Short mmCIF file of C-alpha atoms and ligand atoms in Angstrom, two decimals:
data_model
loop_
_atom_site.label_atom_id
_atom_site.label_comp_id
_atom_site.label_asym_id
_atom_site.label_seq_id
_atom_site.Cartn_x
_atom_site.Cartn_y
_atom_site.Cartn_z
CA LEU U 1 0.00 0.00 0.00
CA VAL U 2 1.09 3.61 -0.58
CA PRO U 3 0.20 5.98 2.30
CA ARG U 4 -0.80 9.40 1.03
CA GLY U 5 1.76 11.12 3.27
CA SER U 6 4.68 9.26 1.72
CA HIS U 7 6.70 9.86 -1.44
CA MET U 8 7.16 6.53 -3.20
CA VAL U 9 9.47 6.61 -6.21
CA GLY U 10 9.53 3.87 -8.82
CA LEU U 11 11.50 3.52 -12.04
CA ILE U 12 9.99 1.83 -15.09
CA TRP U 13 11.86 1.05 -18.31
CA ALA U 14 12.16 -1.36 -21.21
CA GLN U 15 15.61 -2.58 -22.25
CA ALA U 16 17.24 -4.89 -24.72
CA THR U 17 19.28 -7.69 -23.16
CA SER U 18 22.34 -5.41 -23.56
CA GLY U 19 20.76 -2.74 -21.37
CA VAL U 20 20.11 -0.38 -24.28
CA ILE U 21 16.96 1.67 -23.74
CA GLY U 22 17.36 4.47 -26.30
CA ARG U 23 19.23 5.26 -29.49
CA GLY U 24 19.06 8.17 -31.91
CA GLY U 25 16.29 9.90 -29.96
CA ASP U 26 14.00 6.86 -30.08
CA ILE U 27 13.56 3.36 -28.69
CA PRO U 28 15.18 0.88 -31.13
CA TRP U 29 12.34 -1.67 -31.10
CA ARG U 30 8.56 -1.79 -30.74
CA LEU U 31 6.72 -4.15 -28.38
CA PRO U 32 2.96 -3.69 -27.91
CA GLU U 33 2.98 -5.78 -24.73
CA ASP U 34 5.48 -3.35 -23.25
CA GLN U 35 3.36 -0.34 -24.20
CA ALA U 36 0.35 -1.96 -22.51
CA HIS U 37 2.39 -2.85 -19.41
CA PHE U 38 3.89 0.64 -19.10
CA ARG U 39 0.42 2.17 -19.27
CA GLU U 40 -1.10 -0.32 -16.80
CA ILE U 41 1.54 0.50 -14.16
CA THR U 42 1.73 4.26 -14.57
CA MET U 43 -1.91 5.17 -15.19
CA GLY U 44 -3.33 7.57 -12.63
CA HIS U 45 0.05 8.50 -11.12
CA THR U 46 2.55 11.26 -11.63
CA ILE U 47 5.17 10.50 -14.28
CA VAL U 48 8.56 12.20 -14.33
CA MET U 49 10.68 12.22 -17.49
CA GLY U 50 13.84 13.85 -18.72
CA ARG U 51 13.60 16.62 -21.28
CA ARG U 52 14.99 14.34 -24.00
CA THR U 53 12.24 11.79 -23.31
CA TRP U 54 9.63 14.53 -23.69
CA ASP U 55 11.31 15.42 -27.01
CA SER U 56 11.01 11.77 -28.10
CA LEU U 57 7.21 11.82 -27.75
CA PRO U 58 5.32 13.01 -30.85
CA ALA U 59 3.91 16.49 -30.31
CA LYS U 60 0.37 15.21 -30.87
CA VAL U 61 0.68 12.59 -28.08
CA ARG U 62 2.20 14.65 -25.27
CA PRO U 63 1.45 15.18 -22.45
CA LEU U 64 0.73 11.51 -21.94
CA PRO U 65 -2.95 11.09 -20.94
CA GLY U 66 -4.25 10.01 -17.56
CA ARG U 67 -1.10 10.93 -15.63
CA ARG U 68 0.33 14.18 -14.30
CA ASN U 69 3.35 14.84 -16.56
CA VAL U 70 6.50 16.41 -15.10
CA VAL U 71 9.61 17.08 -17.21
CA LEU U 72 13.12 17.66 -15.85
CA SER U 73 15.27 20.33 -17.52
CA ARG U 74 18.05 22.69 -16.48
CA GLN U 75 17.16 25.10 -19.29
CA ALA U 76 15.15 28.06 -18.02
CA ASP U 77 13.60 28.52 -21.48
CA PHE U 78 12.58 24.91 -22.14
CA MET U 79 8.78 24.64 -22.08
CA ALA U 80 6.55 21.54 -22.26
CA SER U 81 3.06 22.48 -23.39
CA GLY U 82 0.46 20.81 -21.18
CA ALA U 83 3.01 19.72 -18.56
CA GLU U 84 5.21 21.11 -15.80
CA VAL U 85 8.96 21.62 -16.24
CA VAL U 86 11.08 21.57 -13.08
CA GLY U 87 14.81 21.71 -12.49
CA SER U 88 15.25 19.03 -9.84
CA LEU U 89 13.95 15.78 -8.41
CA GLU U 90 13.22 17.67 -5.19
CA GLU U 91 10.60 19.61 -7.15
CA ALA U 92 9.43 16.65 -9.25
CA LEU U 93 8.79 14.15 -6.43
CA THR U 94 5.99 15.82 -4.47
CA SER U 95 3.23 13.29 -5.22
CA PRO U 96 2.58 10.23 -3.03
CA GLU U 97 3.46 7.86 -5.91
CA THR U 98 5.73 8.86 -8.79
CA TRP U 99 6.95 6.78 -11.72
CA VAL U 100 10.19 7.91 -13.33
CA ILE U 101 9.69 6.97 -16.98
CA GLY U 102 13.16 7.72 -18.37
CA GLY U 103 15.45 8.27 -19.93
CA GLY U 104 18.95 7.08 -19.07
CA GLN U 105 20.11 10.25 -17.33
CA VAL U 106 16.97 10.56 -15.24
CA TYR U 107 17.00 6.90 -14.14
CA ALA U 108 20.52 7.40 -12.79
CA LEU U 109 19.47 10.67 -11.16
CA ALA U 110 16.45 9.14 -9.42
CA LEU U 111 17.99 5.79 -8.45
CA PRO U 112 19.14 6.79 -4.91
CA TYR U 113 15.53 7.68 -4.00
CA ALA U 114 13.79 4.76 -5.69
CA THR U 115 12.41 1.69 -3.94
CA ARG U 116 10.84 -0.10 -6.92
CA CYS U 117 11.87 -0.83 -10.51
CA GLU U 118 9.62 -2.40 -13.13
CA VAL U 119 11.59 -3.67 -16.11
CA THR U 120 10.64 -5.13 -19.46
CA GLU U 121 13.54 -6.94 -21.09
CA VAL U 122 13.28 -7.56 -24.83
CA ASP U 123 15.29 -10.43 -26.33
CA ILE U 124 16.55 -8.37 -29.27
CA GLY U 125 20.28 -8.41 -29.96
CA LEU U 126 21.21 -4.71 -29.90
CA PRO U 127 24.73 -4.24 -28.53
CA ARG U 128 25.57 -0.95 -26.88
CA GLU U 129 26.77 1.87 -29.13
CA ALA U 130 28.36 5.16 -28.16
CA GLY U 131 25.71 7.69 -27.20
CA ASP U 132 23.01 5.12 -26.41
CA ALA U 133 20.81 5.64 -23.39
CA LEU U 134 21.19 2.72 -20.99
CA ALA U 135 19.25 1.19 -18.13
CA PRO U 136 20.64 1.92 -14.66
CA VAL U 137 22.70 -0.79 -13.03
CA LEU U 138 21.18 -2.21 -9.83
CA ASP U 139 23.36 -3.04 -6.83
CA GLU U 140 22.81 -5.78 -4.25
CA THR U 141 20.41 -3.68 -2.16
CA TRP U 142 17.88 -4.34 -4.93
CA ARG U 143 16.07 -7.68 -4.76
CA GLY U 144 14.55 -8.84 -8.01
CA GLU U 145 11.81 -11.10 -9.28
CA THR U 146 12.45 -12.33 -12.83
CA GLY U 147 9.60 -13.62 -14.94
CA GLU U 148 9.94 -16.45 -17.44
CA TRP U 149 10.47 -15.61 -21.10
CA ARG U 150 7.19 -14.81 -22.85
CA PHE U 151 6.56 -14.31 -26.55
CA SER U 152 5.12 -11.17 -28.12
CA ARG U 153 2.61 -11.00 -30.95
CA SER U 154 5.46 -9.12 -32.71
CA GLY U 155 7.70 -12.19 -32.63
CA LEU U 156 10.13 -11.11 -29.92
CA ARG U 157 10.72 -12.84 -26.62
CA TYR U 158 10.37 -10.60 -23.58
CA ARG U 159 10.29 -10.94 -19.81
CA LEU U 160 9.34 -8.78 -16.85
CA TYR U 161 11.36 -8.00 -13.74
CA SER U 162 10.19 -6.35 -10.53
CA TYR U 163 12.83 -5.04 -8.15
CA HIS U 164 12.35 -3.68 -4.64
CA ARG U 165 14.36 -2.29 -1.77
CA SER U 166 13.57 -0.64 1.55
N1 NAP J 1 13.13 2.06 -23.35
C1 NAP J 1 12.63 2.92 -22.35
O1 NAP J 1 12.06 2.47 -21.42
C2 NAP J 1 12.82 4.41 -22.52
C3 NAP J 1 12.16 5.28 -21.67
C4 NAP J 1 12.34 6.63 -21.81
C5 NAP J 1 13.17 7.12 -22.82
N2 NAP J 1 13.81 6.25 -23.67
C6 NAP J 1 14.70 6.73 -24.71
O2 NAP J 1 15.99 7.23 -23.91
C7 NAP J 1 16.52 8.26 -24.59
C8 NAP J 1 16.49 9.56 -23.76
O3 NAP J 1 17.31 9.28 -22.64
P1 NAP J 1 18.55 10.30 -22.28
O4 NAP J 1 19.38 9.67 -21.19
O5 NAP J 1 19.27 10.71 -23.53
O6 NAP J 1 17.80 11.68 -21.74
P2 NAP J 1 16.71 11.84 -20.55
O7 NAP J 1 17.17 11.22 -19.30
O8 NAP J 1 15.35 11.51 -21.04
O9 NAP J 1 16.74 13.45 -20.45
C9 NAP J 1 17.95 14.08 -20.16
C10 NAP J 1 17.63 15.54 -19.85
O10 NAP J 1 17.04 15.60 -18.67
C11 NAP J 1 17.55 16.92 -17.98
N3 NAP J 1 18.30 16.50 -16.81
C12 NAP J 1 19.21 15.55 -16.61
N4 NAP J 1 19.66 15.63 -15.35
C13 NAP J 1 19.02 16.68 -14.78
C14 NAP J 1 19.10 17.21 -13.50
N5 NAP J 1 19.96 16.76 -12.44
N6 NAP J 1 18.34 18.25 -13.17
C15 NAP J 1 17.49 18.79 -14.10
N7 NAP J 1 17.40 18.27 -15.34
C16 NAP J 1 18.18 17.21 -15.66
C17 NAP J 1 18.35 17.52 -18.89
O11 NAP J 1 17.53 18.40 -19.74
P3 NAP J 1 18.16 19.79 -20.37
O12 NAP J 1 19.19 19.37 -21.40
O13 NAP J 1 16.93 20.44 -21.02
O14 NAP J 1 18.72 20.60 -19.24
C18 NAP J 1 18.90 16.39 -19.78
O15 NAP J 1 19.32 16.75 -21.05
C19 NAP J 1 15.72 8.41 -25.88
O16 NAP J 1 16.32 7.68 -26.87
C20 NAP J 1 14.37 7.79 -25.44
O17 NAP J 1 13.63 7.39 -26.67
C21 NAP J 1 13.66 4.90 -23.52
C1 HWI J 2 6.42 2.28 -23.87
C2 HWI J 2 7.94 2.50 -23.69
C3 HWI J 2 8.32 2.38 -22.23
N1 HWI J 2 8.21 1.15 -21.69
C4 HWI J 2 8.50 1.00 -20.40
N2 HWI J 2 8.36 -0.25 -19.90
N3 HWI J 2 8.94 1.97 -19.60
C5 HWI J 2 9.07 3.20 -20.12
N4 HWI J 2 9.50 4.17 -19.32
C6 HWI J 2 8.74 3.44 -21.48
O1 HWI J 2 8.89 4.70 -22.03
C7 HWI J 2 7.79 5.63 -21.82
C8 HWI J 2 8.07 6.83 -22.71
C9 HWI J 2 8.03 6.42 -24.18
O2 HWI J 2 6.64 6.08 -24.46
C10 HWI J 2 6.37 5.36 -25.62
C11 HWI J 2 7.35 5.08 -26.54
C12 HWI J 2 7.08 4.33 -27.69
C13 HWI J 2 8.17 4.04 -28.71
C14 HWI J 2 5.79 3.88 -27.87
C15 HWI J 2 4.80 4.16 -26.94
C16 HWI J 2 5.06 4.89 -25.79
N5 HWI J 2 4.09 5.20 -24.87
C17 HWI J 2 3.91 6.55 -24.22
C18 HWI J 2 2.39 6.44 -24.44
C19 HWI J 2 1.55 6.34 -23.13
O3 HWI J 2 2.14 5.91 -22.09
O4 HWI J 2 0.36 6.71 -23.18
C20 HWI J 2 2.63 5.02 -25.06
#
């Protein structure tokens, strides 16, 4: 349960088996089951994203519906129509339950405050290239549940992980 006086922080991402989450301003695969899962978990909560993740959303789609959208930027003139731009996690994490939805920089930034990670891993062979955005590495304080490999309508294997810590 999430008490309303708390500030729970979760991270949610989809990665290739290499840990790649982003390349060239996009995600280098498509998996409908991951889109459905991401929406099931985040719906109704505040979502926090880095400015480059906001940029990666088509203008017509953003802000993402059904969730309070918060974007992190250090640029005083960056504006996100329909959403709030703040300069720090201190300002972004005021809700009782917040999902950090990427990208690579913001996962690393939020990791010290997070107590849950929800991961989709896609069995697509995409080795890491310079400039890629990557999933955060999780130390031994994080305890994980790994699901069995499942198979997408799109013909890719995928599996879910849930990590927690105190
Ligand atoms: N597979 C997934 O689950 C997933 C999820 C989300 C995104 N992605 C992909 O990941 C990539 C984007 O990730 P990324 O690592 O390049 O960028 P990002 O984390 O989305 O955004 C980085 C931006 O966030 C701001 N930022 C970073 N640290 C900050 C801090 N301490 N305080 C205030 N603002 C801060 C900065 O904006 P300013 O430069 O404006 O100051 C920085 O440029 C894209 O390819 C995207 O498609 C994948
Ligand atoms: C779904 C990708 C994803 N997957 C997981 N597991 N974690 C994340 N943080 C995550 O990136 C969330 C931000 C990027 O978003 C999208 C990206 C693409 C290529 C297709 C659909 C969406 N979606 C936002 C729209 C919505 O949510 O309404 C549908």
